[PDB]
Design an enzyme around this catalytic site. Structure first.
Site, PDB file in Angstrom:
ATOM      1  N   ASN A  10       0.836  -1.197   0.000  1.00 15.17           N
ATOM      2  CA  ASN A  10       0.000   0.000   0.000  1.00 15.17           C
ATOM      3  C   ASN A  10       0.874   1.251   0.000  1.00 15.17           C
ATOM      4  O   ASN A  10       1.888   1.303   0.686  1.00 15.17           O
ATOM      5  CB  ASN A  10      -1.033   0.006   1.143  1.00 15.17           C
ATOM      6  N   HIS A  80      -8.752   0.518   4.400  1.00 11.37           N
ATOM      7  CA  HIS A  80      -7.515   0.537   5.168  1.00 11.37           C
ATOM      8  C   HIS A  80      -7.668   1.355   6.450  1.00 11.37           C
ATOM      9  O   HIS A  80      -8.444   2.323   6.505  1.00 11.37           O
ATOM     10  CB  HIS A  80      -6.345   1.056   4.325  1.00 11.37           C
ATOM     11  N   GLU A 152      -5.704  -6.646   9.334  1.00 14.36           N
ATOM     12  CA  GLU A 152      -4.649  -5.792   9.856  1.00 14.36           C
ATOM     13  C   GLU A 152      -5.007  -5.260  11.234  1.00 14.36           C
ATOM     14  O   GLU A 152      -5.892  -4.422  11.360  1.00 14.36           O
ATOM     15  CB  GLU A 152      -4.388  -4.625   8.911  1.00 14.36           C
TER      16      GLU A 152
END
Length: 232
Positions: A10, A80, A152
């Site tokens: 990313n 994200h 994550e």
């Protein structure tokens, strides 16, 4: 066995693309470089390694997705950490973006994960499953062929504190089990679930040995080459 692994970064970029282009990758792995809008044109002109694809990030506007697809961008990263905890994208906003992208012809890497306090308080399962449940509500079974999940822990993002192989495995297994139960065991078997959060080459190799880890989401840095090598 395991489905095809993915190594995804990313968002000097020029030296970085040089490194990637020169790298022989001797196993089957889909590599992905995601970047902001302003860097997409350059990265597409520059990144020529055929095991790599370019990905957008966070586009949620229908015209924007259409424009990216026309431009030859077929992958996108959504949800994200900072999009949720800073920008304020809710589970539902992320789910709508994922559905919109799939409808627009994209492969989607959708990110989920719990905060520091959620982990500490034992709420990891309920949080992570609620996040993927929202995503699943907006998709049909067939859409999962275009979906990749990135787990994550927020407390592991950019903090130098990676999840232990056991923590990562437990999270991935919980997600995959939910997918099997709610969506289908066929979908669950093919689903790539990637780990993100302070991955480096050494820790990456060990994490990949876990049953339910299918690759990684990490920073666009030189050591990404080691992360790629770790996906076997």
């Amino acid at each position: 066995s395991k489905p095809q692994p993915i190594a995804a970064a990313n968002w000097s970029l020029s030296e970085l693309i040089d490194l990637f282009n020169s790298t022989s990758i001797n196993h089957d792995v889909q590599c992905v470089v995601a970047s902001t809008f302003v860097h997409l044109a350059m990265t597409k002109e520059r990144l020529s390694h055929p095991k790599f694809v370019i990905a957008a990030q966070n586009a949620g506007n229908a015209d924007a997705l259409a424009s990216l697809k026309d431009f030859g961008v077929n992958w996108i990263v959504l949800g994200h950490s900072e999009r949720r905890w800073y920008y304020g994208e809710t589970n539902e906003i992320v789910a709508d973006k994922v559905a919109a992208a799939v409808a627009s012809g994209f492969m989607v890497i959708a990110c989920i994960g719990e905060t520091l306090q959620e982990r500490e308080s034992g709420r990891t399962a309920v949080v992570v499953l609620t996040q993927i449940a929202a995503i699943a509500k907006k998709l049909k079974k067939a859409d999962w062929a275009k979906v990749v999940i990135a787990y994550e822990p927020v407390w592991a993002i950019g903090t130098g504190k990676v999840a232990t192989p056991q923590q990562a495995q437990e999270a991935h297994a919980l997600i995959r089990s939910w997918v099997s139960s709610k969506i289908g065991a066929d979908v669950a078997g093919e689903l790539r679930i990637l780990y993100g959060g302070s991955v480096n080459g050494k820790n990456a190799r060990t994490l990949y040995q876990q049953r339910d880890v299918n690759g990684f989401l990490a920073g666009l840095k030189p050591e990404f080459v080691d992360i790629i090598k770790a996906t076997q």
